[PDB]
Design a protein around this ligand. Structure first.
Ligand code: DCP
Ligand code: CA
Ligand code: MG
Ligand code: MG
Length: 342
DNA sequence: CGGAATCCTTCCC
DNA sequence: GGGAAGGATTC
């Protein structure tokens, strides 16, 4: 099993750079504007120029502007980035049928039947990099290992505009020296627990008990690290299908008033149905973010597809249902559709 | 105090 | 033995 993983470098920011070459060299920050206050929202991605100074994904725009007042701040153009992504994803299919596309910017390729060793798995890697650079002007990072996780760790270590193989030795060598928060699927809320638990490196997942580990972080995560540590993990490359689509909006002011909210809910429906595009959902969930910032939802499943009219009808019923079971004032309202037919 | 979507735990009448 | 409402990761 030889796994080759491609992650596009600082994607949104890079597409912007390609589309506007004057942006070459300066800090560029792609933003999600929430719309409550002007400049309310979050940085989605910054190019390396901006990163260098602390402007990174997830931080408030206001914060980013305290650090780099004169950076170029742009709104997200998901529809412009997905064009480029879809094109590159097709380009990658010319190498492997078994291709697992995990995000707008990431794909795994099981290239076992295609190459004979890591040497010339590396060479197929460069052929992949160059072809993207010539075709799209986008630079990518290639990660290569025995399984998906390590192929990805390889990519992280080698970015941006890089290529890295991790053989069976390096795999053993990484099991004992990689920080735990650098393992894919392990984010902040998990990585901080293990700190207190004594766990820092991946090898530590056998330094102490399983019930001590499973007790804090859960069966599937505790198992996951163990199987990686024991050098056992091997999930196959699988074609992924989008499972759900939705849209959440922030209201101008918090409310419990059903009639004041309806316009926001109906707007979320309209955007969701534009996003669906001839995908027909069987389930709708109304999602409501509290004044306390807690996430509350209530859904419904149908034996059939949901016309936009039923969506309008049922969303209200579900909103009313959230109203009867909550005291607080709603800040953010949204809708989620799932269980597609066809 | 952002958006989006995945793959887990999770008790119900 | 489901369901549906929840976490957490990532985007
Ligand atoms: N709090 C966060 C964190 C991340 N992301 C998103 C923005 C990125 O577009 C995406 C992809 O993650 P990558 O690690 O691939 O980051 P980038 O592609 O932006 O840069 P790089 O590839 O150099 O890491 O995750 C987000 O929306 N909100
Ligand atoms: Ca994505
Ligand atoms: Mg990526
Ligand atoms: Mg990337």
């Amino acid at each position: 099993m030889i796994v080759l993983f491609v992650d596009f470098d600082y994607f949104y920011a890079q597409v912007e750079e390609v589309l506007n070459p004057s942006l070459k060299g300066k800090p560029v920050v792609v933003c999600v504007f929430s719309g409550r206050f002007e400049d309310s929202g979050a940085v989605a991605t910054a190019n390396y120029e901006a990163r260098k100074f602390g402007v990174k994904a997830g931080i408030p725009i206001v914060e980013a502007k305290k650090i780099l007042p004169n950076a170029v701040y742009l709104p997200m153009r998901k529809e412009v980035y997905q064009q480029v992504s879809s094109r590159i994803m097709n380009l990658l299919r010319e190498y492997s049928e078994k291709i697992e596309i995990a995000s707008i910017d990431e794909a795994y390729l099981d290239i076992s039947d295609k190459v004979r060793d890591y040497r010339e798995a590396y060479n197929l890697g460069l052929e992949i990099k160059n072809k993207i650079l010539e075709k799209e002007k986008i630079t990518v990072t290639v990660g290569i290992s025995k399984n998906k996780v390590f192929a990805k760790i390889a990519a992280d270590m080698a970015k941006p505009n890089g290529i890295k193989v991790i053989d069976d030795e390096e795999v053993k060598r990484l099991i004992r020296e990689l920080d735990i928060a650098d393992v894919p699927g392990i984010g902040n809320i998990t990585a901080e627990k293990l700190k207190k638990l004594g766990i820092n490196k991946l090898v530590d997942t056998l330094s102490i008990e399983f019930d001590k580990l499973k007790g804090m972080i859960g069966e599937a995560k505790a198992k996951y690290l163990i199987s990686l540590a024991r050098d056992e993990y091997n999930e196959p490359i699988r074609t992924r299908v989008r499972k759900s689509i939705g849209r959440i909006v922030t209201m101008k002011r918090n409310s419990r008033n059903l009639e004041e909210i309806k316009p926001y809910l109906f707007r979320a429906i309209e955007e969701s149905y534009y996003k669906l595009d001839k995908r027909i959902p069987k389930a709708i969930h109304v999602v409501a973010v509290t004044e306390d910032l807690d996430i509350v939802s209530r859904g419904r499943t149908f034996p059939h597809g949901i016309s936009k009219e039923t969506a309008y009808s049922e969303s209200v019923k579900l909103l009313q249902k959230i109203l009867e079971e909550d005291e607080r004032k709603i800040r953010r309202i949204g809708v989620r559709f799932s269980k597609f037919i066809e």
